[PDB]
Design a binder for this molecule. Structure first.
Ligand SMILES: CCCCCCCCO[C@@H]1O[C@H](CO)[C@@H](O)[C@H](O)[C@H]1O
Ligand SMILES: CCCCCCCCO[C@@H]1O[C@H](CO)[C@@H](O)[C@H](O)[C@H]1O
Ligand SMILES: CCCCCCCCO[C@@H]1O[C@H](CO)[C@@H](O)[C@H](O)[C@H]1O
Ligand SMILES: CCCCCCCCO[C@@H]1O[C@H](CO)[C@@H](O)[C@H](O)[C@H]1O
Ligand SMILES: CNCCCN1c2ccccc2CCc2ccccc21
Ligand SMILES: CC(C)C[C@H](N)C(=O)O
Ligand SMILES: [Cl-]
Ligand code: NA
Ligand code: NA
Length: 509
């Protein structure tokens, strides 16, 4: 069994797991689209009532399972609840991270592609006034890279460069994962995190130096950090805030659990878990929130910045920011640093969502690390073609797996660990070996508050928001739904084979 060599490696690996594209690309959009400061209140509450408690729960379930040679939920859920059904529900712990990896790695490859082009200076050349004359060249740049449709058809035509970069991205992910936990994920985390931090701070510093006739970077911070209690009664903001919390902290993806399964039985998961969660939040609200938003508001003002965030989730990070940078000396290089930052941020997170499948193949099907990594890479690479060529396929996978799936799974793992397994056993398991104890009140939060909070959230969602996404979408969404449902059946079949394999082994022993 592989174990994290050092505590710093563990923290930086777990921090690398959480700190990713969600901090720098997703958070800014979610905040701006929901009133900025009006989004922060529910976000902070969601972090305290959902983020923190679930982080500890996943670290606990992981370490508990790893002690018995299991790093994924199909097996761990069964250990906590001896029921054939626990194995089915556990499949989501392999499905979610696999589906998310299918589109996450692709988006990650974009940042590598852009980074390369911006470094070499193969970027557009804007006409020397007029906002549209500045932004259009960059919009075209993105649209040509990923191949956005021009006609009436929902078909994408990625550039050859984009495709080749995706292959390289997969290769880089494999090169790290194939070396294992300590010599792969950990070695890399110790290099990537410090780099990521320096790049992020440098960018924040450069961004503040932005002052135009429309505003300053300070105006952006005020927008993001000014309370608006008139939206606290809006369910949509709460759904957005909770969704962001889950995504940014890697909760409900089965990633934290798998990583924690490599933590030694005696090791502290309380302080370690809290540190990883805190590092992510700092990287999100302080770093992530201080780059994109302040820069957009500085050049276009609050109103226009918000409109740009509402048009295309990728606008602000792949079109707007590099466009804004292009108007300053060394702006192309600054764009390179922005995309290089995103690449490392994503790379440290993509290896985390691919490890669960790898761990399952090693733990349950007894495959060698080499074979487990290559097969996982093959499944992701192949499946990724659907996201690369079918328009809005990405949007669909992100919803079922990265949005609904994670909240549902988060509630499932809590119920299984804190209700079925036992609230008092769970509590003991979480605190065992801890350098610090979990505050007493959190017992009540985990047992009553968190589950009730997520239960209400899921109910409202399925009533006033999801029916539209089941009756107001293009027919091609069914191609993606069909395929991801097939992935679930495939994983269920593997769980079944793992059962038959273990049974046969128990007879020979
Ligand atoms: C995975 C099973 C079959 C995959 C076939 C992939 C064929 C990719 O084909 C490539 O697509 C690129 C755009 O994405 C084009 O730019 C290339 O010219 C084209 O050769
Ligand atoms: C550097 C790591 C991967 C580099 C892949 C480069 C793929 C280049 O691909 C080429 O790009 C040219 C534009 O630059 C196009 O005009 C060509 O049609 C295209 O085939
Ligand atoms: C993902 C499920 C199916 C993916 C099918 C991808 C088929 C790619 O097909 C290729 O597309 C290229 C343009 O991108 C064309 O230039 C090639 O002639 C065509 O063969
Ligand atoms: C399914 C996910 C992506 C599918 C991309 C399909 C791109 C198809 O492209 C089409 O391929 C046909 C042959 O199959 C050709 O006869 C058409 O002329 C060509 O436009
Ligand atoms: C509305 N569709 C775009 C969905 C994808 N998306 C992702 C997903 C993974 C990593 C980054 C992002 C950045 C853009 C973004 C913003 C808000 C929700 C989802 C997303
Ligand atoms: C899916 C997770 C690994 C995503 C990561 N926590 C991020 O914020 O990008
Ligand atoms: Cl290109
Ligand atoms: Na994050
Ligand atoms: Na990361």
């Amino acid at each position: 069994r592989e174990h994290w060599a050092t505590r710093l490696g563990l923290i930086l690996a777990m921090a690398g797991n959480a700190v990713g594209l969600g901090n720098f690309l997703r958070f800014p959009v979610q905040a701006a689209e929901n009133g900025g400061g009006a989004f922060m209140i529910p976000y902070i509450i969601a972090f305290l009532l959902v983020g923190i408690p679930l982080m500890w729960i996943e670290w606990a379930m992981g370490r508990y399972g790893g002690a018995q040679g299991h790093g994924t939920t199909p097996a761990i859920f069964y250990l906590l609840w001896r029921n054939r059904f626990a194995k089915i529900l556990g499949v989501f712990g392999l499905w979610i991270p696999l589906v998310v990896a299918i589109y996450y790695v692709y988006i990650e490859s974009w940042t590598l592609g852009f980074a390369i082009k911006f470094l070499v200076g193969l970027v557009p050349e804007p006409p020397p006034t007029d906002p549209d004359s500045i932004l259009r060249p960059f919009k075209e740049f993105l649209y040509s890279y990923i191949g956005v449709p021009k006609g009436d058809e929902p078909i994408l035509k990625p550039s050859l460069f984009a495709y080749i970069v995706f292959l390289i991205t997969m290769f880089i992910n494999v090169s790290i994962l194939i070396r294992g936990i300590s010599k792969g994920i950990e070695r890399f985390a110790k290099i990537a995190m410090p780099t990521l931090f320096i790049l992020a701070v440098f960018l924040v510093i450069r961004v503040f130096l932005l002052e135009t006739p429309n505003g300053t970077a300070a105006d952006g911070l005020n927008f993001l950090w000014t309370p608006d209690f008139e939206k606290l009664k809006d369910p949509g903001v709460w759904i957005a805030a909770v969704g962001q919390i889950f995504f940014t902290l890697s909760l409900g993806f089965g990633a934290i659990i798998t990583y924690a399964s490599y933590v030694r039985k005696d090791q502290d998961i309380v302080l370690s878990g809290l540190t990883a969660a805190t590092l992510n939040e700092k990287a999100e609200v302080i770093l992530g929130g201080s780059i994109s938003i302040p820069a957009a508001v500085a050049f276009f003002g609050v109103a226009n910045a918000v409109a740009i965030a509402k048009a295309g989730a990728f606008n602000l990070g792949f079109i707007t920011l590099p466009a804004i940078f292009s108007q300053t000396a060394g702006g192309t290089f600054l764009g390179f640093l922005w995309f290089f930052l995103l690449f490392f941020a994503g790379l440290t997170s993509s290896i985390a969502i691919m490890q669960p499948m790898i761990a399952f193949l090693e733990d349950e099907l007894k495959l060698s690390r080499k074979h487990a990594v290559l097969w996982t890479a093959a499944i992701v690479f192949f499946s990724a073609h659907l996201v690369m060529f079918l328009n809005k396929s990405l949007d669909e996978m992100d919803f079922w797996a990265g949005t609904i799936g994670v909240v549902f799974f988060g509630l499932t793992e809590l119920i299984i660990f804190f209700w079925i397994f036992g609230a008092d056993k769970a509590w003991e398991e979480i605190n065992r070996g801890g350098i610090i104890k979990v505050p007493r009140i959190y017992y009540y939060v985990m047992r009553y508050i968190t589950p009730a909070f997520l239960a209400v959230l899921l109910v409202v969602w399925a009533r006033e928001y999801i029916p539209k996404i089941m009756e107001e979408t293009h027919w091609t969404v069914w191609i993606t739904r069909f395929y991801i449902i097939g992935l679930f059946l495939f994983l269920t079949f593997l769980v079944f084979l793992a059962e038959r394999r273990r049974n046969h082994e128990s007879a020979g022993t």
